[PDB]
Design an enzyme around this catalytic site. Structure first.
Site, PDB file in Angstrom:
ATOM      1  N   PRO A  31       0.828  -1.215   0.000  1.00  0.00           N
ATOM      2  CA  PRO A  31       0.000   0.000   0.000  1.00  0.00           C
ATOM      3  C   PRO A  31       0.855   1.255   0.000  1.00  0.00           C
ATOM      4  O   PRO A  31       1.495   1.582   1.005  1.00  0.00           O
ATOM      5  CB  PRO A  31      -0.820  -0.124   1.292  1.00  0.00           C
ATOM      6  N   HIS A  59      -4.154   4.998   7.000  1.00  0.00           N
ATOM      7  CA  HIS A  59      -2.780   5.490   6.952  1.00  0.00           C
ATOM      8  C   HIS A  59      -2.483   6.193   5.630  1.00  0.00           C
ATOM      9  O   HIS A  59      -1.890   7.281   5.607  1.00  0.00           O
ATOM     10  CB  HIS A  59      -1.828   4.314   7.177  1.00  0.00           C
ATOM     11  N   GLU A  60      -2.909   5.588   4.516  1.00  0.00           N
ATOM     12  CA  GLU A  60      -2.674   6.173   3.199  1.00  0.00           C
ATOM     13  C   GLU A  60      -3.444   7.475   3.019  1.00  0.00           C
ATOM     14  O   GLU A  60      -2.931   8.433   2.427  1.00  0.00           O
ATOM     15  CB  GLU A  60      -3.052   5.175   2.103  1.00  0.00           C
ATOM     16  N   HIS A  63      -1.648  10.147   4.947  1.00  0.00           N
ATOM     17  CA  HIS A  63      -0.481  10.559   4.169  1.00  0.00           C
ATOM     18  C   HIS A  63      -0.868  11.507   3.040  1.00  0.00           C
ATOM     19  O   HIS A  63      -0.267  12.572   2.875  1.00  0.00           O
ATOM     20  CB  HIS A  63       0.228   9.329   3.597  1.00  0.00           C
ATOM     21  N   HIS A 190      17.757  -1.292   7.296  1.00  0.00           N
ATOM     22  CA  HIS A 190      17.860   0.157   7.168  1.00  0.00           C
ATOM     23  C   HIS A 190      19.311   0.618   7.116  1.00  0.00           C
ATOM     24  O   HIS A 190      19.650   1.534   6.359  1.00  0.00           O
ATOM     25  CB  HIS A 190      17.113   0.823   8.319  1.00  0.00           C
TER      26      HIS A 190
END
EC number: 3.4.17.23
Lengths: 198, 99, 265, 146
Positions: A31, A59-60, A63, A190
């Site tokens: 997503p 969440h999207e 954003h 990361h």
């Protein structure tokens, strides 16, 4: 719009493909949001009937709402104050959607179900397993990375150094010792692509 | 005709052209993420390379502008983000070694 | 392009009776009534400017408070009518072209010649040239004059116009009288008919007329050689504000006009 | 244009403040200052024309709108532009009010007896009373009576 943020473009919904793309054309299912620039946004996922799909959708939309908020600001200023702000403001809209009174008001949850103290305690324990569980791990990763990238600690003093403050700082002991050539805290996703933890 | 107005028009033209290039690259990346093709790979690869060359050119042209001669916070901040060094002192062998 | 332009003549005669027009759009039957307005005086002194034409003439003929224009012509050599104030592409100026296809009416500034000319013809056509086009207007209509080559063994007809400038409502009146007298104006009575009114709003001070005769067929070999100093008979009279009495018929005409300041009778 | 319509240019910076209905068509590279433009220059030559982009995927505030601006003018001159008026049917032999033209009348209508002349609209008696009117649309003569 119950919160107070206004509605936006009706051509965006058709512009975003939401169900399974299938094998007719190769497409990912992560997503993801797309702030393409001058008045054009897209979302991309394959929607299934999961509660976590609703969480990721919220969440999207958080954003993309923050994306279109600073559209009046120029292209260099068309971001958040820093990098962590955007993920944080996505996360609070992600977590705030898991409130059962909202689901009862919108009819997602039937009014027969009720919230007790022990269920709330279990939910808080799961939240601690997700949020505050990762906080000291992020802390010691950030501290070790900062001593590494500052170039202050010796390179060859890492016989047990990351092991020992893993033992004393967060309370995790390795089962097997490792030699100098190991760089396991530097072996994570990361750090391997130079993505910060601050 | 002070340096602030030149910085303003340079910032505006950079914003417009970089907005066009970013729009093209993001559009190509989005329709490639929906429909994976090698031609789309070449599309946003060329777009991203041209945008990287453009941002380098804008940074080098903005190096002329004095960062201490701006009193507006917004123009000072945007010039600061435009007058970044990046590869001010960097050997090409060192850069390719890093890459 | 422009051509030889130093030619001027003069003449002098009188005018007996002509110069009566209808006052406005109104009709009566057998009623004798009076008005006070602009008119051509009876038995008044006019200025025969030029006698007869293959000749050149370049006069600077002024204008004041309407004008009575009269001319005899066969095959309609006269084609152009130019009014205006500055006449040098400075202010708007009138232009009437009465070609056999259709009459063209155009008001604006024009950088024509000081003494303009139109024609040289056959095969191809020598059209309007030597002008500026920094201006907008339009009008087109059926040409005023009747059919060309209207000549027989005897005399046929005579053309007459009057022009009046008032309130930006430029009015033209006209008649084509068929006469057989062969000597200047005829002894008789008639009227003048209203045909065209143009809303323009431009002051006029000087005006001239144009001839569209082909000077030759071939351009460089032949042109003009030893034929100048003259122009056709187009009697010019002015107007004064006076009173008249008119007589009306049973169908509605104007058959008699008597001056109100000529004699005690 | 699906690939972007860049033919729609606009001038970002002009030499001075705009005049009402003033047009800039020259492609002069706008020397802003601190350095002469000198043909083409990097820092201070500054071509001010800017394209629109105009893809169909552009936003609502970014989509190409088409705009017509209209300005009228009045002066101390004959008015050449007006608005049309629709006339009702005409009746006869009834004591009615009428507006055949700019004149206003009232009375009974009767058919023609006297022929007119084509450049005529008003029939009058010896006492300045109008009594004959030619209809505007149809070329029929009508006579009014009080």
């Amino acid at each position: 719009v119950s919160v107070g943020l206004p509605n936006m473009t009706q051509g965006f919904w058709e512009n975003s493909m939401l169900t399974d793309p299938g094998n007719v054309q190769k497409a990912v299912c992560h997503p993801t949001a797309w702030d393409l620039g001058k008045g054009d946004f897209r979302i991309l996922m394959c929607t299934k009937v999961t509660m976590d799909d609703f969480l990721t959708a919220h969440h999207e939309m958080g954003h993309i709402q923050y994306d279109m908020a600073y559209a009046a600001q120029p292209f260099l200023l068309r971001n958040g104050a820093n990098e962590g702000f955007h993920e944080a403001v996505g996360e609070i809209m992600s977590l705030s959607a898991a409130t059962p009174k909202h689901l009862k008001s919108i009819g997602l949850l039937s009014p027969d179900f009720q919230e007790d103290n022990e269920t709330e305690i279990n939910f808080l324990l799961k939240q601690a397993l997700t949020i505050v569980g990762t906080l000291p791990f992020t802390y010691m990763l950030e501290k070790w990375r900062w001593m590494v990238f500052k170039g202050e600690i010796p390179k060859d003093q890492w016989m047990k150094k990351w092991w020992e403050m893993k033992r004393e700082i967060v309370g995790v002991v390795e089962p097997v010792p490792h030699d100098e050539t190991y760089c396991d805290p530097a072996s994570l996703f990361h750090v391997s692509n130079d993505y910060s933890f601050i | 005709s002070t340096i602030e107005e030149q910085a303003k028009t340079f910032l505006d033209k950079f914003n417009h052209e970089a907005e066009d290039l970013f729009y093209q690259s993001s559009l190509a990346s989005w329709n490639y993420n929906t429909n994976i093709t090698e031609e789309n790979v070449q599309n946003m690869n060329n777009a991203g390379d041209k945008w990287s060359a453009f941002l380098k050119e804008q940074s080098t042209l903005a190096q002329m502008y004095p960062l201490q001669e701006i009193q507006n916070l917004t123009v000072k901040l945007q010039l600061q983000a435009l007058q970044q060094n990046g590869s001010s002192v960097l050997s090409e062998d060192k850069s390719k070694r890093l890459n | 392009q422009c051509v030889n332009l130093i030619t001027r003549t003069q003449s002098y005669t009188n005018s007996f009776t002509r110069g009566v027009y209808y006052p406005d759009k109104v009709f009566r039957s057998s009623v004798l009534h009076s008005t006070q307005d602009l008119f051509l005086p009876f038995f008044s002194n006019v200025t025969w400017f030029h006698a007869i034409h293959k000749r050149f003439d370049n006069p600077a003929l002024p204008f004041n408070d309407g004008v009575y224009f009269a001319s005899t012509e066969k095959s309609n050599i006269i084609r152009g009518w130019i009014f205006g104030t500055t006449l040098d592409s400075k202010t708007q100026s009138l232009l009437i072209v009465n070609n056999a296809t259709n009459v063209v009416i155009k008001v604006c500034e024009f950088q024509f010649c000081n003494d303009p000319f139109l024609d040289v013809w056959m095969e191809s056509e020598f059209r309007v040239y030597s002008s500026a086009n920094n201006c907008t207007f339009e009008y087109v209509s059926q040409p005023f004059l009747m059919d060309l080559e209207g000549k027989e063994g005897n005399f046929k007809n005579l053309r007459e116009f009057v022009f009046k400038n008032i309130d930006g409502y430029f009015k033209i009146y006209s008649k084509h009288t068929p006469i057989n007298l062969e000597r200047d104006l005829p002894q008789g009575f008639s009227a003048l008919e209203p045909l065209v009114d143009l809303p323009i709003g431009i002051n006029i001070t000087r005006f001239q007329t144009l001839l569209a005769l082909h000077r030759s067929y071939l351009t460089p070999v032949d042109s003009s050689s030893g034929w100048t100093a003259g122009a056709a008979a187009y009697y010019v009279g002015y107007l004064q504000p006076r009173t008249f009495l008119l007589k009306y018929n049973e169908n509605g005409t104007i058959t008699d006009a008597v001056d109100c300041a000529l004699d005690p009778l | 244009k699906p690939s972007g319509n860049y033919n729609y240019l606009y001038r970002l910076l002009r030499k001075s403040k705009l005049k009402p209905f003033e047009r800039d068509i020259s492609t002069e590279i706008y020397q802003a200052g601190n350095k002469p433009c000198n043909g083409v220059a990097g820092p201070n030559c500054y071509s001010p024309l800017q394209s629109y982009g105009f893809r169909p995927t552009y936003g609502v505030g970014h989509q190409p709108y088409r705009v017509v601006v209209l300005s009228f003018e009045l002066l101390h001159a004959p008015a050449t532009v007006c608005g049309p008026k629709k006339s009702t049917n005409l009746v006869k032999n009834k004591c009615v009010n009428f507006n055949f033209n700019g004149l206003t009348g009232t009375g009974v209508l009767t058919e023609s007896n006297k022929k007119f002349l084509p450049f005529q609209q008003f029939g009058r008696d010896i006492a300045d009373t109008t009594d004959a009117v030619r209809d505007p649309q149809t070329l029929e003569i009508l006579d009014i009576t009080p």
